[PDB]
Amino acid sequence: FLRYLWREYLHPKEYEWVLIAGYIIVFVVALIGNVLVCVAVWKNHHMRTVTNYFIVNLSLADVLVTITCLPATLVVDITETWFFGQSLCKVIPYLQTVSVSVSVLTLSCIALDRWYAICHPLMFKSTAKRARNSIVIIWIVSCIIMIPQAIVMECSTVFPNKTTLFTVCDERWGGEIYPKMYHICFFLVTYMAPLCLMVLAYLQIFRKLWCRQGIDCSFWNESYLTGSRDERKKSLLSKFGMDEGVTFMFIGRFDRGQKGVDVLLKAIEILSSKKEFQEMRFIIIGKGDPELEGWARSLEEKHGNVKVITEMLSREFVRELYGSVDFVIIPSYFEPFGLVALEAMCLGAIPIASAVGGLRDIITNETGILVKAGDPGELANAILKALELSRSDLSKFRENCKKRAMSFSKQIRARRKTARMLMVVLLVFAICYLPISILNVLKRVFGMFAHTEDRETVYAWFTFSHWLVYANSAANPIIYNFLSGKFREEFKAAFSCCC
């Protein structure tokens, strides 16, 4: 008898079986998965990155609503009734909307941290303190900007002589204007503005990481060289009509203010009055400013130990140069990436480079000679230092260079995998939150569904959009499992230790 009056009162929806099944599944997967995300980062020091601290924040927001909001949303969508009283009518929508804000601002800070790391020339000194500060800000801002949402939620009773009633929890507005302006702002803040800004940031990240950085490691590879470096250097100098000696190469456009050939040509003039010059060989490859081409050709004419190549060389020829010269001179004024240094170093050539940009990122004190950009006397001094180094075995130096370039290349690949995972996370968020965000706008800004001819269908769309929001929480740990080997390994460790 006790279930009877309630079943007479609560009219079943034909699809409640699948709604309940889908909520139970999402509940279990989101709870276990997001807890294991937190456990993986907290227990394993190699997982401590700013990115993963933000991911932990995302997983905490998702645990919060999985436990406090999802069960209530299921009951409401099944019964169209609010059972939980007035205070929880404010608290539960408040937690839900706070968590949406936390999620999207956390995704935003993830995108900014990757943009500063990859696209901005500088680097933050703080990492974990900066992440902590950002997370605190995210929660403070989120809790404050959703105060209005908590203010407008109210319980209302409706009496269909009355013998019955029902109570719903809903936004209470005085007038038609306020909900329109409020839900415009709500849409911009939770969905439209951060998504547009993150799409822009990840497009620039993609363009820098995939199109402006990286080296083809299957090609720039010493496996393709034959004989000893001594044999190849001797062959190289024989083919270029030069005597044996310490061999320097430059390759790049000829200009004033970018690639530095002007600095190198001045450095050669400085060196040319010194007796050490006679031990040095220069190979200068490039094309561009005709006054600089003429300066270079004038030097080639003056000096038997200077050769200038303005013709186009195949990449295989260049690889042979990198694998036989002693040093590569990279006297850039400006060099965001420094592909020349990575290619040369992969092949054992030791770089002498300006301390700018990506050259400064790549080259350490055991893997090259850094010089102040723009300074021919400094470059001349570095070339003299390289001559003196070359009077002894350079093997360990060449090995250090190869290893550093491989390690830098590995880091680029790792950043690509992480960025790809983060873009998939963003795409899945955009998808999971599109229906509820657009339904909310159509209903509250444009007044759709006011007097609808098919309330059943509209109600079904809203119920699905709510489920899809919680399903996002279940999806994120699954994404980390497929696109991060580090998360995949710690998840497997968890499932294997408990079974």
Ligand X SMILES: CCCCCCCC/C=C\CCCCCCCC(=O)O
Q: Which residue ranges are tagged as binding site?
A: 440
**Shortest distance, position 69 Cβ to ligand 7MA, whole Å:** 6
Give whichever of 242 and 445 is closer to ligand 7MA, judged by the CB atom. Answer: 445
Partner whose footprint covers residue 414, from ligand 7MA, ligand X, none (CB < 5 to 8 Å by kind): none
Q: Binding site for suvorexant, residues?
A: 440
Question: Do residues 131 and 120 lie in contact, with contact meaning Cβ atoms separated by under 8 Å?
Answer: no
Paired with 158 in beta bridges are 166
Print the SS3 string covering 220-275. Answer: CCHHHCCCCHHHHHHHHHHHCCCCCCEEEEEECCECCCCCCHHHHHHHHHHHHCCH
Partner whose footprint covers residue 97, from ligand 7MA, ligand X, none (CB < 5 to 8 Å by kind): ligand 7MA
Partner whose footprint covers residue 460, from ligand 7MA, ligand X, none (CB < 5 to 8 Å by kind): ligand X
The one among 95, 146, 268, 474 contacting ligand X by CB under 6 A: 474
Partner whose footprint covers residue 337, from ligand 7MA, ligand X, none (CB < 5 to 8 Å by kind): none
Give whichever of 165 and 438 is closer to ligand 7MA, judged by the CB atom. Answer: 438
Length of the chain equals 499
Stretch near ligand X under the rule CB under 6 A, chosen from 26-34, 142-150, 181-189, 345-353: 26-34
Stretch near ligand X under the rule CB under 6 A, chosen from 20-28, 185-193, 289-297, 401-409: 20-28
Please give the Cα distance from 432 to 468 (Å, whole number): 6
Please give the Cα distance from 9 to 165 (Å, whole number): 10
**Shortest distance, position 90 Cβ to ligand 7MA, whole Å:** 10
In three-state secondary structure terms, 329 is strand
**Shortest distance, position 142 Cβ to ligand X, whole Å:** 22
Partner whose footprint covers residue 188, from ligand 7MA, ligand X, none (CB < 5 to 8 Å by kind): none
Please give the Cα distance from 487 to 478 (Å, whole number): 10
Residues 6+ apart with CB under 8 A from 115: 201, 204, 205
Partner whose footprint covers residue 463, from ligand X, ligand 7MA, none (CB < 5 to 8 Å by kind): ligand X
Stretch near ligand X under the rule CB under 6 A, chosen from 81-89, 355-363, 376-384, 458-466: 458-466
Q: Which two tokens stand for residue 342?
A: 């990575």
Is 477 a binder of ligand X (CB under 6 A)? yes
Partner whose footprint covers residue 474, from ligand 7MA, ligand X, none (CB < 5 to 8 Å by kind): ligand X
The one among 10, 181, 431, 438 contacting ligand X by CB under 6 A: 431
The one among 384, 478, 493, 494 contacting ligand X by CB under 6 A: 478
- Residue 331, φ and ψ in degrees, nearest 5: -90, 45
Is 432 a binder of ligand X (CB under 6 A)? yes
Is 15 a binder of ligand X (CB under 6 A)? yes
CA angle at residue 259 from 404 to 405, to 5 degrees?
10
The one among 20, 137, 200, 414 contacting ligand X by CB under 6 A: 20
**Shortest distance, position 151 Cβ to ligand 7MA, whole Å:** 12
In three-state secondary structure terms, 157 is strand
Q: Which two tokens stand for residue 124?
A: 């933050």
Please give the Cα distance from 313 to 322 (Å, whole number): 13
Question: Do residues 136 and 56 lie in contact, with contact meaning Cβ atoms separated by under 8 Å?
Answer: no
Please give the Cα distance from 413 to 394 (Å, whole number): 29
DSSP, residue by residue, 297-314: HHHHHH-TTEEEE-S---
Residues found near ligand 7MA in the complex (CB under 6 A): 69, 73, 76, 92-93, 96-97, 100, 169, 186, 190-191, 433, 436-437, 440, 466, 469-470
Residues 6+ apart with CB under 8 A from 157: 165, 166, 167
**Shortest distance, position 230 Cβ to ligand X, whole Å:** 48
**Shortest distance, position 490 Cβ to ligand X, whole Å:** 11
Residues 6+ apart with CB under 8 A from 334: 257, 258, 356, 357
Q: List binders of ligand X among 164-193 (CB under 6 A).
A: none
**Shortest distance, position 47 Cβ to ligand X, whole Å:** 16
Q: Which residues lie near ligand X (CB under 6 A)?
A: 14-22, 24-26, 29, 32-33, 424, 427-428, 431-432, 456-457, 460, 463-464, 467, 471-472, 474-475, 477-479, 481-483, 488, 491
